[PDB]
Amino acid sequence: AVTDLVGASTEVSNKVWDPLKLSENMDESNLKLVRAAELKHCRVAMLATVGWLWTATGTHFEGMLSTSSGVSFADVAAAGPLLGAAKVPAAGIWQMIAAIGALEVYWENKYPAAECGGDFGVPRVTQDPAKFKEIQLAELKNGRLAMIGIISFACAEAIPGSVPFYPF
Amino acid sequence: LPELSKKLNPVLGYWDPLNLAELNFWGAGDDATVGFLRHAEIKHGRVAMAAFVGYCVQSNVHFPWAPFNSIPTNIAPAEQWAQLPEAAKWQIILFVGFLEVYSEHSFILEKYGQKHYMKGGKPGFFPDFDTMVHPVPLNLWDPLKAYKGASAERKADGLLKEVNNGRLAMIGIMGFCAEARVPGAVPALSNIAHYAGDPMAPFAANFHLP
Amino acid sequence: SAKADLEAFAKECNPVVGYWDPLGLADLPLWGQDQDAVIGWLRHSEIKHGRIAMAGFVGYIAHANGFRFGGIGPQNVVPEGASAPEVWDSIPFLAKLQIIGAIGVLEHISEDKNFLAADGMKHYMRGGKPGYFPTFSANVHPMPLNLFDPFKWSKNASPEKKAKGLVTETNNGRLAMLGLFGFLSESKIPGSVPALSGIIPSYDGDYMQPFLPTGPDTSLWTIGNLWA
Amino acid sequence: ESLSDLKTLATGLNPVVGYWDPLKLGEAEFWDNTNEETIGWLRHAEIKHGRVAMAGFVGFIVQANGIKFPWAPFNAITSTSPPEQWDQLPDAAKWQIILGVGFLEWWSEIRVDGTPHYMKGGKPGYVPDFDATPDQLPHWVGLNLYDPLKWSKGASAEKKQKGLLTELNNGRLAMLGIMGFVSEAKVPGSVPLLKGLVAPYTGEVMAPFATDIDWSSW
Ligand code: CLA
Numbered sequence: 001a002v003t004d005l006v007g008a009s010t011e012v013s014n015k016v017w018d019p020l021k022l023s024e025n026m027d028e029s030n031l032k033l034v035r036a037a038e039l040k041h042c043r044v045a046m047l048a049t050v051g052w053l054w055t056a057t058g059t060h061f062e063g064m065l066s067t068s069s070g071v072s073f074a075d076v077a078a079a080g081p082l083l084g085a086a087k088v089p090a091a092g093i094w095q096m097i098a099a100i101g102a103l104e105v106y107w108e109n110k111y112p113a114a115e116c117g118g119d120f121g122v123p124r125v126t127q128d129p130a131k132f133k134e135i136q137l138a139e140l141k142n143g144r145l146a147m148i149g150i151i152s153f154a155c156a157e158a159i160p161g162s163v164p165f166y167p168f
Numbered sequence: 169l170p171e172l173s174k175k176l177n178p179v180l181g182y183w184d185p186l187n188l189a190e191l192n193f194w195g196a197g198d199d200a201t202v203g204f205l206r207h208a209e210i211k212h213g214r215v216a217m218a219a220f221v222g223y224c225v226q227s228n229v230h231f232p233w234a235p236f237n238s239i240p241t242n243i244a245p246a247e248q249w250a251q252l253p254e255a256a257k258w259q260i261i262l263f264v265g266f267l268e269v270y271s272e273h274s275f276i277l278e279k280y281g282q283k284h285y286m287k288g289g290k291p292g293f294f295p296d297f298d299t300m301v302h303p304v305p306l307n308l309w310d311p312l313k314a315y316k317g318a319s320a321e322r323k324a325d326g327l328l329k330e331v332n333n334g335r336l337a338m339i340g341i342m343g344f345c346a347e348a349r350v351p352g353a354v355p356a357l358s359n360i361a362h363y364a365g366d367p368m369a370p371f372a373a374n375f376h377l378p
Numbered sequence: 379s380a381k382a383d384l385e386a387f388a389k390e391c392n393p394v395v396g397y398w399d400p401l402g403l404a405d406l407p408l409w410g411q412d413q414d415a416v417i418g419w420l421r422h423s424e425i426k427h428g429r430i431a432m433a434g435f436v437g438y439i440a441h442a443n444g445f446r447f448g449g450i451g452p453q454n455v456v457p458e459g460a461s462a463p464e465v466w467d468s469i470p471f472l473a474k475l476q477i478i479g480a481i482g483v484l485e486h487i488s489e490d491k492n493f494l495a496a497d498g499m500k501h502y503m504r505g506g507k508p509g510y511f512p513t514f515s516a517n518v519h520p521m522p523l524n525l526f527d528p529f530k531w532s533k534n535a536s537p538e539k540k541a542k543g544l545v546t547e548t549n550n551g552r553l554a555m556l557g558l559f560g561f562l563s564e565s566k567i568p569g570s571v572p573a574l575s576g577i578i579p580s581y582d583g584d585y586m587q588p589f590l591p592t593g594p595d596t597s598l599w600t601i602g603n604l605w606a
Numbered sequence: 607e608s609l610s611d612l613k614t615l616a617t618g619l620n621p622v623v624g625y626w627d628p629l630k631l632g633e634a635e636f637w638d639n640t641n642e643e644t645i646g647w648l649r650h651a652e653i654k655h656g657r658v659a660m661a662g663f664v665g666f667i668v669q670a671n672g673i674k675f676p677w678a679p680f681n682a683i684t685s686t687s688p689p690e691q692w693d694q695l696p697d698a699a700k701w702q703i704i705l706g707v708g709f710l711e712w713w714s715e716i717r718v719d720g721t722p723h724y725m726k727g728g729k730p731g732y733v734p735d736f737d738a739t740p741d742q743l744p745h746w747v748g749l750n751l752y753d754p755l756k757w758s759k760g761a762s763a764e765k766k767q768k769g770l771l772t773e774l775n776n777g778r779l780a781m782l783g784i785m786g787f788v789s790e791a792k793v794p795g796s797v798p799l800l801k802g803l804v805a806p807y808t809g810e811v812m813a814p815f816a817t818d819i820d821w822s823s824w
């Protein structure tokens with residue numbers, strides 16, 4: 001059932017790209033699971049690329065991130081996108097992870113990944129399923145490019161010389 | 169253009185070294201490829217024929233009014249463009265910019281029965297101007313309503329003569345403009361103009377692009 | 379077709395030698411277009427070379443003697459006697475360029491497809507007569523006379539007389555090519571031509587370059603001379 | 607198809623040579639495929655090497671002659687030894703050359719208009735047409751990679767196969783020529799009749815960007 005999906009990209013001549021044959025023997029309720037994992041990776045990667053660009057360009061908020069122990073948003077931004085990740089206090093990291101996990105638990109109990117392949121029922125911008133398949137393919141391609149891009153940003157910030165066309 | 173260039177010129181005719189008639193031109197088509205080229209054939213002719221005749225009057229006499237007057241005449245008129253004020257350069261380009269925008273309006277072009285040139289319309293056809301937000305006495309082509317009573321044979325002869333005089337003048341002005349800077353380019357003239365500034369730079373004497 | 383006509387023309391040129399093709403010149407197709415095109419190209423090149431040779435011999439005699447036409451023109455800048463080789467070194471650069479352009483225009487008119495099609499002829503490499511220059515009745519501006527026959531003094535000659543004249547032209551062109559090459563050799567290297575040694579002077583610039591010594595500009599014309 | 611490989615070669619240099627391969631790269635299987643796929647891959651590799659070699663040989667002749675782009679960034683470097691001109695190029699220029707070539711061959715691998723791949727039965731060394739499928743490219747570009755001005759377009763198939771044979775032979779000769787020039791840049795005395803030309807050079811020609819490893823210990 002891997003030949004159906006949406007992910008058939010014209011960059012690989014509109015056929016399924018599985019050189020290691022990872023989806024040869026995987027069955028339903030796992031194919032939908034790996035599609036849900038890919039879609040969540042897509043969305044988190046796109047949000048991560050936008051946030052990384054916002055931090056690297058410098059933007060940041062105005063105020064004090066944790067008035068008990070200093071640390072302004074300018075202090076977080078000035079350390080860089082990667083090195084300015086430990087400048088956040090541990091309580092802020094735990095609160096962010098707790099809110100994300102509450103959303104994860106609610107959406108997993110409401111829309112299980114094994115049954116719903118990455119579909120959490122967010123409205124929908126079009127009917128006419130051909131256009132919707134085109135929009136799904138656009139989402140998949142954008143998310144895959146963002147998956148490559150955020151790891152590229154992390155590698156270029158940590159190891160200089162890699163990613164030659166890296167801004168900042 | 170079709171193979172009817174034999175009417176414009178025998179011996180030669182559809183010479184076409186760089187083929188250019190089927191390169192599909194933004195994916196529009198082969199007819200649309202022909203229509204765009206034929207318009208740019210004669211639009212470049214109409215500018216060059218007016219500019220070369222424009223040259224031969226500028227270098228001797230100037231209009232005696234005021235603003236584009238009293239600047240030196242014994243210089244290159246390509247340099248005389250650089251002596252114009254900045255508001256004059258903007259207003260000249262934008263006035264032509266209206267004429268380009270107005271003539272490409274397909275709803276104006278279908279008032280007189282024609283269409284945009286590479287959708288099937290005639291290559292060169294300026295609109296008869298009578299649809300503007302406010303009326304004007306004089307239009308652009310045939311202002312005195314003089315020579316629109318001529319038969320199609322005089323129009324067909326004139327349209328071919330417009331092309332052939334067009335190709336002759338595009339060589340005429342550009343070879344002449346190549347004589348102002350880099351002197352000695354045309355050994356037939358070789359006795360006019362100076363100045364090494366770029367003629368393809370209307371605002372070089374005023375500001376810089378970066 | 380091509381080989382039989384070549385052998386017949388060779389026999390008509392000389393009944394003793396006949397077909398004299400040592401380096402297989404009748405068999406090598408130039409632009410991959412069979413032997414007929416090669417034979418036509420060779421015949422046209424031979425006819426053009428012979429005509430240029432006879433004209434060059436006449437011009438060399440005229441330039442060596444000195445027979446300047448009048449005033450105002452290019453004779454006012456050339457020296458009063460400088461032999462044939464230096465006559466192409468003191469003429470104006472614009473004059474030499476315009477002469478080369480006129481020669482190229484004449485060659486292109488002789489090689490144009492519609493120029494031969496209007497006269498009822500064809501190209502000399504695809505089944506045509508070599509050396510058949512087209513007339514001048516299509517250049518829109520009315521030409522006063524044709525280039526082949528200006529006064530049309532050969533409009534009643536027979537085809538046999540035309541063939542005999544073509545054979546005589548080919549033979550005289552070969553003789554003129556030999557004579558012109560001998561004069562060029564004697565003008566540069568002594569001891570080549572034994573009879574012509576000591577007549578023509580020595581030329582420094584080689585006679586195989588058109589832009590050798592660029593000529594002076596020179597106005598040489600009045601009344602409206604806005605071009606310097 | 608170890609039979610059409612001989613039919614191609616009977617027209618290669620007459621029967622004076624034919625199917626000449628001492629180590630017999632034909633009748634191979636390679637990466638878990640059939641002999642036909644390997645034959646098509648090897649033919650495409652030979653054709654691509656030949657095209658790259660003719661382009662490189664012409665570029666070497668032009669660059670060592672002295673013809674150079676005036677514009678702006680290529681005016682900065684002033685050498686002659688083509689290899690050293692590549693070495694003193696900016697890193698971004700070399701990377702953009704490499705990535706543009708990579709995009710061109712990424713398009714070459716894509717078969718959305720022509721039905722077969724060059725391993726699955728297509729013509730080796732066939733770059734697909736840009737405008738054949740105008741709805742399956744990211745944005746429109748005219749002026750296709752092969753035949754930008756459609757000069758060949760309508761031609762006889764005999765002329766097409768004759769041109770393919772001519773391209774293959776010229777490619778092989780250009781491969782030999784450009785490797786002769788590179789070995790001139792590296793090994794003096796090698797490749798006679800070319801000793802008086804080319805400059806001495808170091809820096810492992812078959813490596814871009816940084817240098818200083820080389821085949822110093824042969
Ligand atoms: C989180 C990563 C992830 C996951 C789970 C998937 C999952 C899937 N992809 Mg996919 N993809 C991804 C990332 C991912 N993709 C990226 C980044 C790209 C761009 C290169 C693509 C491009 C792509 C194409 C073009 C196609 C798919 C297709 C598919 C589906 C079938 C293939 C399959 O089961 O094998 C993937 C299953 C996995 C479990 C893969 C997990 C990742 C492995 C184990 C680790 C690899 C490490 C890597 C090599 C290190 C370098 C990467 C990076 C650092 C540069 C499946 C739902 C096909 C499809 O849907 O067609 C219907 C298809 O045609 N993908």
Ligand code: CLA
Pocket residue numbers: 033034036037038040041044096097098100101102104105108113
């Ligand atoms: C309390 C927090 C919380 C909870 C309960 C969940 C719960 C879930 N997440 Mg989730 N997530 C969270 C926070 C949370 N998330 C945060 C903060 C992020 C970052 C924005 C993500 C990003 C994320 C992605 C991208 C994906 C999930 C997925 C999942 C589901 C399966 C998780 C799984 O199998 O274990 C995890 C199992 C593993 C084997 C771990 C992955 C190991 C990889 C190979 C290496 C990654 C590094 C590692 C995670 C970091 C550890 C430290 C490092 C130094 C080693 C589940 C619904 C997946 C899903 O729904 O797919 C069906 C999925 O694709 N989440």
Ligand SMILES: CCCCCC(=O)OC\C(C=C=C1C(C)(C)C[C@H](OC(C)=O)C[C@@]1(C)O)=C/C=C/C(C)=C/C=C/C=C(C)/C=C/C=C(\C)C(=O)C[C@@]12O[C@]1(C)C[C@@H](O)CC2(C)C
Pocket residue numbers: 046047049050122123124125142143145146148149150152163164165166167701705
């Ligand atoms: C040929 C040109 C190539 C350019 C390069 C490129 O491509 O960069 C790619 C790249 C990085 C990179 C590079 C490499 C790829 C590694 C290559 C280079 O390395 C070398 C030497 O090559 C360097 C570098 C840096 O360039 C990164 C790409 C990042 C990418 C692609 C980022 C997409 C975000 C999408 C978002 C955020 C969507 C939000 C959408 C949202 C938030 C919504 O829809 C909200 C929504 O409410 C809406 C509106 C309607 C609702 O019903 C539904 C919901 C609720 C969902």
Ligand SMILES: CCCCCC(=O)OC\C(C=C=C1C(C)(C)C[C@H](OC(C)=O)C[C@@]1(C)O)=C/C=C/C(C)=C/C=C/C=C(C)/C=C/C=C(\C)C(=O)C[C@@]12O[C@]1(C)C[C@@H](O)CC2(C)C
Pocket residue numbers: 398399400401426427428430431432433434435437438441461462463464465466555556558559585
């Ligand atoms: C030096 C060696 C000569 C060539 C010898 C040669 O190869 O033989 C003959 C041959 C081919 C042959 C052979 C066969 C005969 C067929 C058979 C033979 O087998 C035997 C041995 O039996 C073998 C072979 C190969 O020999 C080919 C010969 C071709 C030849 C020699 C063709 C000259 C055209 C002249 C022209 C176009 C004149 C133009 C006119 C000119 C250049 C000018 O107007 C010059 C001039 O304006 C200038 C520049 C300035 C002015 O101020 C002065 C003037 C006005 C003067």
Ligand SMILES: CC(=O)O[C@H]1CC(C)(C)C(=C=C/C(C)=C/C=C/C(C)=C/C=C/C=C(C)/C=C/C=C(\C)C(=O)C[C@@]23O[C@]2(C)C[C@@H](O)CC3(C)C)[C@](C)(O)C1
Pocket residue numbers: 217218220221315318322326333334336337339340341343344354356357
């Ligand atoms: C019956 C009827 O309807 O009315 C008729 C008549 C009427 C009213 C006139 C019509 C009209 C409209 C108009 C306005 C027509 C006018 C058109 C106009 C104004 C046409 C300019 C051409 C300029 C040329 C060809 C320049 C060549 C230029 C040349 C050849 C060169 O400069 C080359 C050269 O410089 C070099 C390179 C070096 C120099 O050393 C030597 C020379 C100089 C040779 C109609 C409506 O159409 C038809």
Ligand SMILES: CC(=O)O[C@H]1CC(C)(C)C(=C=C/C(C)=C/C=C/C(C)=C/C=C/C=C(C)/C=C/C=C(\C)C(=O)C[C@@]23O[C@]2(C)C[C@@H](O)CC3(C)C)[C@](C)(O)C1
Pocket residue numbers: 191192193194195342345346349350366367368746747748749
């Ligand atoms: C020192 C010296 O040399 O003195 C010289 C200086 C100088 C300046 C050289 C001189 C000059 C005058 C010159 C040379 C004037 C030349 C002016 C010129 C030639 C100006 C071109 C414009 C081109 C445009 C607008 C292209 C648009 C092109 C477009 C929008 C496209 O490509 C679209 C495209 O759709 C196509 C068409 C094909 C499609 O399939 C695909 C795509 C989408 C890609 C002189 C007078 O000689 C003297």
Ligand SMILES: CC(=O)O[C@H]1CC(C)(C)C(=C=C/C(C)=C/C=C/C(C)=C/C=C/C=C(C)/C=C/C=C(\C)C(=O)C[C@@]23O[C@]2(C)C[C@@H](O)CC3(C)C)[C@](C)(O)C1
Pocket residue numbers: 660661663664758761765766769775776777779780782783784786797798799800
């Ligand atoms: C259909 C039709 O009508 O066709 C048309 C259409 C079509 C096909 C598109 C066309 C095309 C495309 C093009 C541009 C074709 C041209 C291709 C190109 C550019 C081909 C370069 C080859 C370079 C070589 C062989 C270099 C050899 C170099 C050699 C052999 C050596 O160096 C040997 C040597 O080093 C040794 C080994 C030792 C030394 O001691 C001695 C020397 C130095 C001598 C045409 C041409 O327009 C015709």
Ligand code: KC2
Pocket residue numbers: 214215217218290292293294295308309322323324325326327329330333334
């Ligand atoms: C500075 C600009 C300029 C110059 C120097 C110039 C020179 C010549 C010459 C001299 C060589 C001839 C012989 C000639 C002939 C014709 N011109 Mg020009 N023409 C210029 C501009 C315009 C414009 C704007 C239009 C136009 C037209 C026509 C028509 C057809 C009319 C008809 O068929 O109704 C004919 C026959 C109109 C058009 O083609 O519409 C169909 C149209 O709108 N022309 N034109």
Ligand code: KC2
Pocket residue numbers: 657658660661729730731732733734751752765766767768769770772773774776777
């Ligand atoms: C560095 C670039 C380069 C060089 C130096 C070069 C030299 C020559 C020479 C001279 C030695 C000949 C005689 C020749 C001839 C042909 N070339 Mg080459 N060619 C180059 C590039 C390409 C590309 C990209 C393609 C291509 C092709 C063809 C076809 C087939 C046309 C057809 O079958 O319609 C023929 C006949 C196309 C292809 O092979 O299609 C199957 C195609 O995609 N060529 N080519």
